[PDB]
């Protein structure tokens, strides 16, 4: 995306570097390569470790979404295996489950869940849900009432209620996990420290290479900038896993997979 | 080897650098190693981390398949332990669990499961399964009906129902975990340019190496190219552990083992 | 701060420039290759060290996230299981809110008396303040609420246990934070590092000056910034319960917790 | 100490380079160290990550056996605390649990468990175990039958029956884990590639240092080589956790510790 | 470690005065080779100290679980059997006994005084008879729970809730046992420790060509960095070693004891 602008600036920096090499020692400035080896290696080590942290936050995101599909699938399986006649509670619980997924998606994307929710629930409760500052948690509490009701109506025992309650728990952990990843980012000092350092390193590098490489510094220094810049750029494509880029999590696709999955297990 | 063809190319590029080395002065070419020491160390550091990430995908994928064997082994044990006489149920349930494994392998290899399914289940069921968006998930839900039936029949209590129920949860987690590794590759950005910049570094390397090595240049360049290139491609191999490469997982062996286990001696037990 | 030692590195480099006149006069040589070696080694160690510091930070944030999850689902279980017992709802929630603030005060080594008094009867405040661990005692109090529900027959051993597990989870959160605070790594991790990172940074100009001459301070400031930036960010991340910049907004996280629990039990602050 | 061969071949590889030295430049061949630092470092990085995998695998094998001891300790405890009257059942379950460990060791070493089985169990049960294609697994089935019938005899509720069933689940995870470790080495491509490069690098190296070290080539090129080889040999020393070499897991001693523990807990 | 630092300044002054005679013979020490060697040792020290750190972290987690399990077990006892203070005090004894006994076991020191202060000498003899005393303390703790269950004061459900806490301690015992027996590397740590030791002493000879009278200064700055990093992995590799820091294990056995007496109103002193 935005890297091409910074490598062409690096080509001109090299042109500026060759056209300026004659005036060099007259001013009194000597740039060997060896301290830039030190610096560049150092920057690579820190870039490597940072990029590690970023990949890990991306996979934790993806795991958290995998749990939603896992936990919702087995909740519905448990409903059918334990209460195979009660298709009325099936449809209601399933719609709260599908609501929860879509609501979680919209919450992380900071978008509006009204249509998805009205598509799935009566305005009777859709207003109760959006009346809360924590709508997705409220959907869980409502799904909780459903199994709670089947327990008090004697159709669930304490045991079988507990078996399903634990899947609510699993969805609660997904909710908190997602919220935690969304609010708490990879500390901003990483991008600030490394974006400066990397950008300044690629810019100062030609003036250090020209002593030894002469007319060829434009090439090998755009090379070195390319790998540093794109390694660094891939960290930022991974640190916001809930964003919209094609390189991010296809959250719409996953919510669709979830809905068709639960609607499949219900015969719809 | 995708490496054997490139390795030779690097030999030629190495030949070109030595024949046309003293001519550097005419065209205006100086080329030190130190900029390529730096560049190459950075690429090693990044190769190392990427390879680390791919092995993690390998071991998780191995692990997830490990749990199928475990969870199925113990669900059959619980049936033999709690309903020792219910052999028609034992037989029915084992067939679904063996279907689960083969079905999952096919799902992850994008191959057809119909042959394996019919080998193991009634054809009415082979069509209920093949009809679904997710057949592995349906095989699970049918396995859960069998123990759900024994529970309506009073043969299982809620407690012992839950004990067997938890093993089906365990398999749902394998299914989900396997889809996550399938459905999401690692970002192709990683693959898109990390493999080109390794090649690029590899071919240019002799052009900066000759001045110090002279004749010894084709050897040392191909050595360096070997290590960097085998590392990069091994990483891309283990990234797709449900693939069919030589270092991917033996999914077919593993389903065989699962099958042989659950049908150990006609499915007969003490 | 960090900007002070950056400045002194600019000083140390002009000291190098002026006393370069006298280098082999006094009998002095300083190539850069040895400092490249030392420099890279320190980079590697800073790389690993820093990675462990981030891991502690993520764990602390994760632990606090579990407070919210567990407390949410405890209130959820109370409402689904005992929809009528609103006094218990109110008392448990006031304990679970007391737990969060008391944990914040614990981790910050501050007095929890104000927040406790806001939230609970003074006879309980005194009980909680007497304990070598107020958060532990608050969990026990919460545990008596559901336990008394259980003696009265309103909870079964099963549904009592479902809720007990949540208190178990908070216990684990308590120990996890206790363990992250009560365990600074042996001071070797920092006086190997921030001593050597400091020392390396200010000797680097003397070694850089033969190659670079008047340029010394610029590269020397760049290398020193890079190393110092990395090394200081490590020190912030490893005390995540402190008051520094990159440290958990524990008061915000508590307010979110209280508001969530007030939300689920129909109350408006 | 399979390693002292290549250290000494290195010493003579440096002497060959000492004598062949000035035949170089009209032969024309030159070797500086700079490109070998590049390679040497790149290999050190790859050696580091590989040894890392090799170490995690040894730790997992040690963990797995560790929890055999944990889960059988606590399963025997539960039997004491819940059925203190029933020392006959105590002694049967303990022999199955001791048998499981021995059988799991034999399995992993591919040795005959028959003598150990016949020392712990009635020959009727030995016959059933050895008839299975998965003897260790079939030992768990038999142990589960013990507690299974204590359940049908009403001496265990479903609750306490389930408390002990979970310990058999834990042993099931040990068995599968060990089988998995046993058949899933660190991929061969790893150690295959490193050995070709680490070995080739260690012999070519003195050729590239005599130009700089002259007469001291051996003492420095051997010291560099001991370092890569001993680091790469640590991987070999950690590759078969279940074998019988000195650096492998003392599985016999662990199996004796397990038996000793379970007999301390039942007064034998 | 400081002794090996001052052997390095010696080796440096040797390398200065003897640099004269060196190449009358023809012995060269450049710096590029020792740079390649030192970076590789730095890299391996990086991964080694990573492994060591993880062993140290797992050790602190296991001990943390002791405090967690023992707190929640005693909380469970109070919330579920509020009246049974005699049982409260017996079980708290075993839990506290278990902590000190685990610590003594790990540091191979004598548990007898801690045991004789916490439990009756009939149970001290029983515990001290076993070859696995910490396990025997868990088994004893189990009997207390089991008797409450046979007396019908615990249901199988609520008996089971407390049983899980004992498993948690069982897991801690085994984990700690495994982290003790081990070094997982079978004494290679001695090979790679003296590899740092030798590199640090040949280093001033490789540096004197470039640095002359300055080499003792740059050579030991480097050596301090490498030796401190090594000795630190040595400290973390062995979190129960017979020359470790006992402050936190003692601190933890004291915290849990104090917590438990607090939780059972044996603190504070009555009015
Ligand atoms: Cl689940
Ligand atoms: Cl299992
Ligand atoms: Cl929860
Ligand atoms: Cl256990
Ligand atoms: Cl007995
Ligand atoms: Cl399990
Ligand atoms: Cl071996
Ligand atoms: Cl006994
Ligand atoms: Cl606990
Ligand atoms: Cl008491
Ligand atoms: Cl009390
Ligand atoms: Zn689950
Ligand atoms: Zn239905
Ligand atoms: Zn209806
Ligand atoms: Zn709107
Ligand atoms: Zn399992
Ligand atoms: Zn059968
Ligand atoms: Zn030539
Ligand atoms: Zn939870
Ligand atoms: Zn209420
Ligand atoms: Zn366990
Ligand atoms: Zn007995
Ligand atoms: Zn072996
Ligand atoms: Zn716990
Ligand atoms: Zn009491
Ligand atoms: Zn006290």
Residue numbers in the entry:
A (entry chain D), D (entry chain A): 22 to 289
B (entry chain B): 22 to 291
C (entry chain C): 23 to 291
E (entry chain E): 24 to 294
The authors write:
Human bestrophin1 (hBest1) is a Ca2+-activated Cl− channel essential for Cl− transport in retinal pigment epithelium (RPE). Although the structure of hBest1 is still unsolved, two Best1 homolog structures, one from bacteria Klebsiella pneumoniae (KpBest) and the other from chicken (cBest1), have been previously reported. Overall, the channel is a pentameric assembly with a single ion-conducting pathway, which varies in diameter along its length and is constrained at two narrow points: a “neck” contributed by three residues (I62/I66/F70 in KpBest and I76/F80/F84 in hBest1/cBest1) on a transmembrane helix, and an “aperture” formed by a single residue (I180 in KpBest1, I205 in hBest1, and V205 in cBest1) on a cytosolic helix.
Moreover, the equivalent KpBest mutants (W16A, G18A, S19A, L259A, P262A, G264A, and D269A) all showed an overall similar structure to that of WT KpBest. Notably, the short extracellular domains of hBest1 represent a challenge for quantitative measurement of the surface expression by labeling techniques (e.g., biotin). They can be classified into three groups by different molecular mechanisms: (1) mutations on residues involved in Ca2+ binding, including W24A, G26A, S27A, L294A, P297A, F298A, G299A, and D304A, likely cause defects of Ca2+-dependent activation; (2) mutations at the neck/aperture, including I205A, I205T, 3A, and 4A, increase open probability by functionally mimicking a constant open state; and (3) mutations outside of the neck/aperture, including D203A, P233A, Y236A, Y236C, W287A, and W287F, alter open probability through the neck/aperture residues.
